[PDB]
């Protein structure tokens, strides 16, 4: 029942290979719905989920103007940050930004976010009060002063509490059949001998949405945290996600082991064992 919207911006310089690329994507939860790429043959905001397509040409042109302006703004920001760090004109650098709003199950604003990074390190973030900044170093302090002068925190607060929430709610309604539908994992346990005296038990979760899940193995009812090989949750490509967790167990202590599965889509949490 909890929902969020986020935009993710990536700006990458590439000296000797033209002007910096800017690409923006937008998400509601684990569903991407828009993209803009300054490298595209004809740069424009494009729909990436069916329920966004019903938005009119004024929506698309408003997004495109915003993202075109950002392309220019980030190119200057890249110049500026190069200078703040005394860096040579030879290397490629990346600024990233992620911002958006979280709603609780009642649809009210839980909190807002706006964070930026430079070469993958935290650079500047809006504090949870939506009024003040945390700057990582003396370079970021310069940005902080520029941002205070343009009343940025104030503008973000108005957006995060207003437009962000309102549009997130709109999308959740327009896309309710998917965005507000949790699909439970399909699960099973596999067994493969690794040797005479040990076997792998692998607990699979497939076809679930949203991506948040917990898979654990227990031996005699206690967690096997250090003994579990856990794979990153991965996209199937059809909106759903996949994950597995594995333990190497002594033969035949298999029945002492249980896989536990927690997901929003499930009527009740699952306990599974290998079923020979």
């Amino acid at each position: 029942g909890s929902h969020s919207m986020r935009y993710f911006y990536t700006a990458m310089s590439r000296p000797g290979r033209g002007e910096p690329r800017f690409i923006a994507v937008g998400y509601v939860d684990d569903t991407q719905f828009v993209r803009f790429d300054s490298d595209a043959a004809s740069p424009r905001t494009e729909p990436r989920a069916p329920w966004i397509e019903q938005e009119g040409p004024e929506y698309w042109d408003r997004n495109t103007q915003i993202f075109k302006t950002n392309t220019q703004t980030y190119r200057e920001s890249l110049r500026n940050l190069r200078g703040y760090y005394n860096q040579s004109e030879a290397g490629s650098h990346i600024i990233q930004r992620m911002y958006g709003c979280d709603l609780g199950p009642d649809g009210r604003l839980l909190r807002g976010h706006d964070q930026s990074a430079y070469d993958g390190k935290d650079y500047i973030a809006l504090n949870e009060d939506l009024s003040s900044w945390t700057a990582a170093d003396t370079a970021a302090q310069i940005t902080q002063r520029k941002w205070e002068a343009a009343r940025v925190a104030e503008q973000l607060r108005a957006y995060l509490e207003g437009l962000c929430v309102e549009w997130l709610r709109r999308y959740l309604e327009n896309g309710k059949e998917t965005l507000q539908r949790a699909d439970p994992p399909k699960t099973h346990v596999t067994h493969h001998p690794v040797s005479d005296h040990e076997a792998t038990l692998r607990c699979w979760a497939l076809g679930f949405y949203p991506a948040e899940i917990t898979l654990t193995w227990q031996r005699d009812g206690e967690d096997q945290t250090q003994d579990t090989e856990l794979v990153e949750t991965r996209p199937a490509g059809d909106r759903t996600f996949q994950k597995w967790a594995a333990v190497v167990v002594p033969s035949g202590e298999e029945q002492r082991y249980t896989c536990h599965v927690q997901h929003e889509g499930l009527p009740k949490p699952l306990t599974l064992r290998w079923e020979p």
């Binding site: 935009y7 915003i66 302006t69 950002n70 500026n80 520029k146 940025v152 973000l156």
Partner: peptide
Amino acid sequence: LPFDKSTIM
């Protein structure tokens, strides 16, 4: 809908 103001860093 994205945030509408972009400010140089």
